[PDB]
Amino acid sequence: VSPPPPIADEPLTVNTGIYLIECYSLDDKAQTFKVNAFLSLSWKDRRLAFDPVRSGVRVKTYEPEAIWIPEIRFVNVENARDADVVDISVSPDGTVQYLERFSARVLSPLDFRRYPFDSQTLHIYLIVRSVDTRNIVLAVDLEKVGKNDDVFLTGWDIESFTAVVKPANFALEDRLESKLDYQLRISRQYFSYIPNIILPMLFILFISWTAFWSTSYEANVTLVVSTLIAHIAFNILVETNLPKTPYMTYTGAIIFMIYLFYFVAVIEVTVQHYLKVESQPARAASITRASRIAFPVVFLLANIILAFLFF
Amino acid sequence: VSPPPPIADEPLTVNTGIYLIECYSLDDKAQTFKVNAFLSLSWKDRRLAFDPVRSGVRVKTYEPEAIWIPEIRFVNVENARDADVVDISVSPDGTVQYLERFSARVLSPLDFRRYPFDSQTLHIYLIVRSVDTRNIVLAVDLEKVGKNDDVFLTGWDIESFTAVVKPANFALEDRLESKLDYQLRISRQYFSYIPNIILPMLFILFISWTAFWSTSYEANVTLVVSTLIAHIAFNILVETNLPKTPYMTYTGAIIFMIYLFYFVAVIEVTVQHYLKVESQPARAASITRASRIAFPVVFLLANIILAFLFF
Amino acid sequence: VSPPPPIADEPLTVNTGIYLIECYSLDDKAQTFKVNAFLSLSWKDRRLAFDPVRSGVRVKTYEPEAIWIPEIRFVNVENARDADVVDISVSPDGTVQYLERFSARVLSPLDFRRYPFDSQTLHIYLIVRSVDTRNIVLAVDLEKVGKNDDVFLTGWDIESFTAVVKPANFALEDRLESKLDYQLRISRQYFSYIPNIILPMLFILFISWTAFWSTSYEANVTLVVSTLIAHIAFNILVETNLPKTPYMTYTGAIIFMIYLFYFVAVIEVTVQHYLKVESQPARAASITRASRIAFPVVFLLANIILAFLFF
Amino acid sequence: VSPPPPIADEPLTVNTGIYLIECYSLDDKAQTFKVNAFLSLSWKDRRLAFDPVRSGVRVKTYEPEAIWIPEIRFVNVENARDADVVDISVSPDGTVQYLERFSARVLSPLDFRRYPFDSQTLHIYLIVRSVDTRNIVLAVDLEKVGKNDDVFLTGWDIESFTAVVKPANFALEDRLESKLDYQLRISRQYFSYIPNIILPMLFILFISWTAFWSTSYEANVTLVVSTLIAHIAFNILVETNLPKTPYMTYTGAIIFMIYLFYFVAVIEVTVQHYLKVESQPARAASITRASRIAFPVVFLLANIILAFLFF
Amino acid sequence: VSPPPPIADEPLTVNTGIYLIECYSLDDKAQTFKVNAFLSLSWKDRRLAFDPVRSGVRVKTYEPEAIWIPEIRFVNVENARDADVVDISVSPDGTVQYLERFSARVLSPLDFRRYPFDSQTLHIYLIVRSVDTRNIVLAVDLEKVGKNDDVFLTGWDIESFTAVVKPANFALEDRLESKLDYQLRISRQYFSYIPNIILPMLFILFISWTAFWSTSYEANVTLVVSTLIAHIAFNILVETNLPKTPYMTYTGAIIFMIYLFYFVAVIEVTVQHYLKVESQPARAASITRASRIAFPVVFLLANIILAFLFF
Ligand SMILES: [Cl-]
Ligand SMILES: [Cl-]
Ligand SMILES: [Cl-]
Ligand SMILES: [Cl-]
Ligand SMILES: [Cl-]
Ligand SMILES: [Cl-]
Ligand SMILES: [Cl-]
Ligand code: NA
Ligand code: NA
Ligand code: NA
Ligand code: NA
Ligand code: NA
Ligand code: NA
């Protein structure tokens, strides 16, 4: 079968729609998400047109093999989508109404700069390649774009599912391609990160600062070195949940900065002990008393600077 | 083939049933479970009706391609179910009896608030989309709903498998959809959590409290800091078994609260040492003696408050 | 095609056989195992009967589509088996001899009570559903039941592969079902658990007991707390290899009991230090000397009690 | 269908092109990467030639089954590619223009010597096997070789996608094989390794060197042994991200060398304590003062030697 | 189609060949490896014989459906191979030349006794089952057996790919089976194990022996107990890379033996301290001085004994 013939030099408009049924498996490391949705397609085929009086029927149901169907693909997928045709209905003016239910693993990059207080715009790119007989252009039927109420994405708040109505028409290998952009706006549920990573990480840091109220070098060494090892464990835990980024993330910046605080606390603990052994505890006492104020003040100000730079 | 014609304007009733054969792979993190079951369908097709006297046969067996079969799908699945038709039997009045055996990965959200003393209602949503000729409505044949005795779900007690008999009839993309809710009620086998997570976590906390019977700062620092690191290991272990929730879980609340007890024990150990060095051991002794009662009493009361808020 | 017609009211006997070729991927956590085997089927179809003199041939080879073949399924599988027909041979009396090679992931629950000194009976349930024309019953052809010599299951000793010759005939959705039970008896190769988990776990426990020959509280605290952390690591390691059970396993009981020994050792170390500080080292010496005998004796007796209860 | 007949003894030239759409899942351990691209093929088939005046059409569109298409395969794949034909267009002279969209998991070895400051040349080998009637040779149509702008590879900078225009023609099982080499040049985004592995690893090493400003053996033992354990954690973390190589990687060399620095620091800490106990602290003081300069100087020089040998 | 008829009572010889293209994913734990290769088959079918003068053609190309092809399978696979026919060529005498390209996950057990200095013989078992008309025997065409030069197996040195030319002819379910053994000889690249596991494990052990040059019980306890915990981490790391074996591996023996050295070092450290407290440091000094020689000498000799028993 060949595509429908053009009245004038006009291209063939294929009206599209995506209705999300299930949304799942958003892999932060892979930058992928899995989708289960309806894909609706509509175009006019004058060759399929019929008399309602003469034929008796108001609409004709065809099997995919019986009629011409546009080769519609997704750009940003891993493998060709798993699809199952639900219905094909032809009106007697030749207006075809196609509906399929599909599942695909969509590849969409994420911006981790503000992690875990980040928001994302996931994309689903629909595409059609023009044939030699005719040029095919995609359009959005807004009445056929949406999502089910029950659609949930573990660890995410689904904000909106909309389509950029104007297609990106371009040439690829000397043929017109009509590309449509479907956008799923999400925002991370940061809640769990507070009692599981942030608050624990702060507690161990504050425990290391108790060395500023101790003259016992052996105890101070144990306090600062032990809490530093727990901080290393939290750093490893965080980086296993995230992919390697060519930029600094918000959590990554805080985690990295806290290492500098542990390093300076080791210097303070060392300086204090050296002075005490040198019979200079009065100078050591001045440094330790200053450290009690300096460490929390510099930590608070550095975090204000970080929060300002990132948000 | 077209759907059966309506006598009057009445919709076509498709009676359904699900009989669970195997239940497995309940993934807490993914909020998914795998199912292997029978799906029974029954509807009247007057065009298939025959006289038992004339034809000779009491029932006619057809192949799926030979007759009209309703396009029945699951709402909350990852991918279309893997199905294999078992039987299609037509009675003289045109009553069709369809049976298939399928397997599917069902996406059903879980409520982890009371974890690991939680109960869940897993859902399997059956759905049919109306055609242009006729409107299709789903119904439950209660005699065809059930489960095999051998059906087990590792780490769970299967309570019941029932169906909400009245369908959710609604419009989706200007067509009637008839949705049925099948509910599998389960309750977690909490047993293993007691000797593997809860009891060990309490033992290490109680070991940290031995510092209240010691004047040795170096030993106290080792006791409280070492047990805190073991607590961090249990926290990481627990959160690997669970997905990130925008709410606090029961275990998560206990785990988080225990950090505050470690933090205050570090303060006590620090205060006691500072006072001893300041030649004030009488004041330090009063604080340590109070701590011996305060810590277990505040721990017991805070746990009563938590258990009350969660159950 | 319809099933063979009954001479008298007798059911149609389908003789079965399973010959294991490959056995692999026994997942303890999932309670699944993967199998690759031959499935042989034999039944009489009088409609296929022929004269060897007239036809010339001793046996007739048919393609699956050409003749009636019983819809044979496995009960306890994840998905329908991956099968490939090898041969279909018909004898002059109409006796059909079918052979296929299949692969399936079989779901069979395991009893971990005696782990890792446990034995299991894996099951493969063959099933046939009766048709409206005739009732179909399964039988075992013992000459066609067996396994290849090279059949190995990593970490397991394959003991026997037999079939319960009498089928479980029952009604499911108003139709007769004939179920056969194939049993693969296995026993775990416990060897590796001795140098990798048991012996190391005992060594660290015995190291904690050296604190009974030390008066140094700081060293004792280090000894008992450090070895307890290594015991936590072994507990976490063991529970990653096992699923969560609503009962106590043998290894789980030993692991749990050892926590009580660490807890009492901390109490002893604390009591000894408190008494020494109170200027009562004579009383402390009596407790420490008793502990040197009490700890290994109570450990040995408790293990005899455990081994008796579990075996 | 048979291949096109040769005018003279000349082989049949199949012009090829690969246009990358999506690039993903570069597994360092497996030495694999996943690709989604267009594969364009062009060859002359004089039997398909037609007159544009007589036929009316400028180009003829065929289905794959209708005409002869060369059996084109990838050498370095896991499984045969997942392909879907997009278009087949024949020009009046018989010039066939084939286009398919495919996805494949490509097996290409990586050189980890300079890791994580490494660059790679990923290969995609196209191959055709000659038939008995004719010899088939591959060619590159440079106008049909390229990549989409949006093509990203998490943790990598895509440099170029080019083809080695001259094929590797050879004999395999007494038949000519024409192999083409498509090269994707990439360079690793090392950024993240600096705040996550390298800087932390240096901090813990520098903390171990504070023992050179302490006379307390107990504190020194804690400092050097604790930091060594954190170094073991970083070594284990690094080797989980990398496959086992029969050569030394840059990071592997630095990680290994740092063990020698910890080992010598333990010797220094031991020697210092032995001398102090032997009433020789003046000799011990000379060794510790030298160590304060020797350790950072030898570390800096050894790293210059390593960086020189590796880059 | 039926198999070729026998001139005399001779069986039908199917000449075989395997040419490896890609070798990958050797899973030590699963005892599996993935292969991508050519499978060549050749047999004489007198019914397909033709005159080159009369027909005009020197060779006839057939589609698999058109002619009889032997049902060739692999014994030690997980699932049936993924195959794609490349060519089928018939010579005038009826000699058929079949070629397919396949991919399969091969199940072949490994001997870990000498790990990681082990060598393996991977097996690929080809098999044919005789039909009722004729007996089918397999043969090796040595000119069609080989491997590509680029064939690499991450962490392994590919030594040779040969075939045992004489088949194992046997009876399975009253039918002849002709089995061929293809052997891929590999040897592990042990290099990486030296700087990543062996050298680090020795360093921590040697650090524990510094306690023999210290009279400080508290420091000795820290040294021996801390290094023992790092040894536990290396033991856990090693056993995650290996499957559970009913025998002792070389690395497993060394790892286990080192526990005994840590245990005896704890006894030495305990005995030394007990004697010092008992005012017997002269006896303690004799034991510690002996230990300085005994520990490295017994370690070196025990390793010579182990290396002798294993190689
Ligand atoms: Cl697609
Ligand atoms: Cl479905
Ligand atoms: Cl099945
Ligand atoms: Cl391919
Ligand atoms: Cl050549
Ligand atoms: Cl050739
Ligand atoms: Cl196979
Ligand atoms: Na079509
Ligand atoms: Na139908
Ligand atoms: Na059939
Ligand atoms: Na310590
Ligand atoms: Na073709
Ligand atoms: Na065939």
Side-chain angles (χ1 to χ4, degrees), chain B residues 19 22 24 36 59 82 86-87 89 99 101 103 152 154 189 192-193 195 199 214 216 219 223 226 241, chain C residues 31 71 74-75 77-79 107 129 132 172-173 175 217-218 225 232 235 244 246-248 256 270 274:
Chain B
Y19 183 88
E22 286 313 315
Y24 55 97
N36 192 308
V59 280
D82 159 25
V86 170
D87 192 51
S89 285
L99 184 72
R101 196 178 155 179
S103 65
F152 76 105
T154 309
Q189 293 176 334
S192 55
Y193 295 88
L199 288 189
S214 164
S216 173
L223 275 156
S226 297
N241 296 161
Chain C
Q31 293 177 153
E71 292 174 14
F74 288 119
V75 183
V77 286
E78 299 220 316
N79 295 74
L107 180 58
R129 183 174 176 85
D132 217 285
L172 168 46
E173 288 194 23
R175 287 268 179 84
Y217 181 58
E218 309 74 36
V225 174
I232 292 164
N235 185 2
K244 283 154 188 179
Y247 54 80
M248 218 74 92
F256 181 77
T270 309
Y274 193 91

Side-chain angles (χ1 to χ4, degrees), chain D residues 3-14:
Chain D
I7 284 175
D9 220 353
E10 94 284 346
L12 172 73
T13 293
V14 174

Side-chain angles (χ1 to χ4, degrees), chain D residues 31 71 74-79 107 129 132 172-173 175 217-218 225 235 244-247 256 260 274, chain E residues 19 22 24 36 59 82 86-87 99 101 103 144 152 154 191-193 195 199 214 216 219 223 226 241:
Chain D
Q31 293 177 153
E71 295 178 8
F74 288 118
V75 183
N76 59 328
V77 284
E78 299 220 317
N79 295 75
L107 179 59
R129 183 175 176 84
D132 217 285
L172 167 47
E173 289 192 21
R175 287 266 182 85
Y217 181 57
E218 309 73 37
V225 173
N235 185 2
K244 281 155 188 176
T245 53
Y247 54 80
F256 180 77
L260 306 161
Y274 192 92
Chain E
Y19 183 88
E22 285 313 315
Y24 55 98
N36 192 308
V59 281
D82 159 24
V86 170
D87 193 49
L99 184 72
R101 196 177 156 180
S103 64
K144 275 170 162 37
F152 77 104
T154 307
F191 180 91
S192 55
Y193 295 88
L199 288 189
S214 164
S216 173
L223 275 156
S226 297
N241 295 161

Side-chain angles (χ1 to χ4, degrees), chain E residues 8 27 29 39 44 56-57 87 100 126 144 151 165 167 171 180 184-185 201 211 214 216 272-274 277 302:
Chain E
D27 187 328
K29 278 183 105 68
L39 170 69
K44 200 187 200 86
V57 287
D87 193 49
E100 65 160 64
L126 259 193
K144 275 170 162 37
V151 171
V165 292
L180 279 174
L184 177 66
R185 263 158 289 264
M201 193 179 282
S214 164
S216 173
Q272 177 203 41
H273 176 67
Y274 193 91
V277 165

Side-chain angles (χ1 to χ4, degrees), chain B residues 19-34:
Chain B
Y19 183 88
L20 314 171
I21 304 154
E22 286 313 315
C23 207
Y24 55 97
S25 299
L26 201 177
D27 186 329
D28 287 88
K29 279 182 104 68
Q31 293 177 153
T32 61
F33 72 96
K34 290 184 191 271

Side-chain angles (χ1 to χ4, degrees), chain C residues 57-285:
Chain C
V57 287
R58 304 253 152 82
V59 281
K60 287 180 182 176
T61 307
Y62 290 90
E63 270 273 292
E65 314 77 12
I67 60 141
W68 180 85
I69 291 160
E71 292 174 14
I72 306 289
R73 292 175 301 276
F74 288 119
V75 183
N76 58 327
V77 286
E78 299 220 316
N79 295 74
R81 77 196 186 262
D82 159 25
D84 287 288
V85 178
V86 170
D87 192 50
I88 300 165
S89 285
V90 175
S91 74
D93 57 295
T95 295
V96 192
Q97 289 215 308
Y98 173 101
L99 184 72
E100 65 160 64
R101 196 178 156 180
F102 75 88
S103 64
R105 190 171 177 210
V106 190
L107 180 58
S108 206
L110 315 159
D111 185 355
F112 294 96
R113 276 159 188 94
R114 293 181 182 193
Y115 182 109
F117 307 97
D118 56 300
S119 283
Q120 308 298 333
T121 302
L122 300 179
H123 301 268
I124 303 164
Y125 297 106
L126 259 193
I127 203 153
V128 77
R129 183 174 176 85
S130 289
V131 292
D132 217 285
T133 59
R134 214 162 164 203
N135 280 44
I136 314 149
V137 155
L138 289 184
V140 176
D141 178 2
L142 293 161
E143 295 163 287
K144 275 171 164 35
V145 176
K147 60 172 203 75
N148 195 51
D149 299 322
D150 306 326
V151 170
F152 77 104
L153 202 52
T154 311
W156 296 88
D157 289 309
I158 295 119
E159 298 303 316
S160 83
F161 183 66
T162 72
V164 176
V165 292
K166 295 292 171 285
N169 295 332
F170 64 101
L172 168 46
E173 288 194 23
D174 208 16
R175 287 268 179 84
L176 192 136
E177 296 260 359
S178 195
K179 185 170 119 291
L180 279 174
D181 184 14
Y182 282 82
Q183 304 173 347
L184 177 66
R185 263 157 289 264
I186 59 171
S187 64
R188 199 186 300 272
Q189 292 175 336
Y190 57 83
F191 181 92
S192 53
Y193 295 89
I194 302 153
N196 294 307
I197 290 113
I198 292 147
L199 288 189
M201 192 179 283
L202 293 178
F203 291 139
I204 52 143
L205 176 71
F206 301 164
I207 281 158
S208 86
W209 297 349
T210 67
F212 307 137
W213 285 269
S214 164
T215 46
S216 173
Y217 181 58
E218 309 74 36
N220 293 355
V221 155
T222 299
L223 275 156
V224 189
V225 174
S226 297
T227 54
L228 170 67
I229 278 153
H231 182 69
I232 292 164
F234 281 110
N235 185 2
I236 297 165
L237 175 62
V238 165
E239 65 182 283
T240 71
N241 295 161
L242 284 172
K244 283 154 188 179
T245 53
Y247 54 80
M248 218 74 92
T249 65
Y250 180 54
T251 304
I254 299 164
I255 291 165
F256 181 77
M257 187 197 68
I258 292 168
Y259 276 107
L260 306 161
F261 280 84
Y262 278 110
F263 194 76
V264 182
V266 168
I267 308 302
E268 193 284 329
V269 156
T270 309
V271 172
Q272 177 203 41
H273 176 67
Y274 193 91
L275 292 168
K276 293 255 185 287
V277 166
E278 248 191 357
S279 297
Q280 272 163 253
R283 192 178 166 183

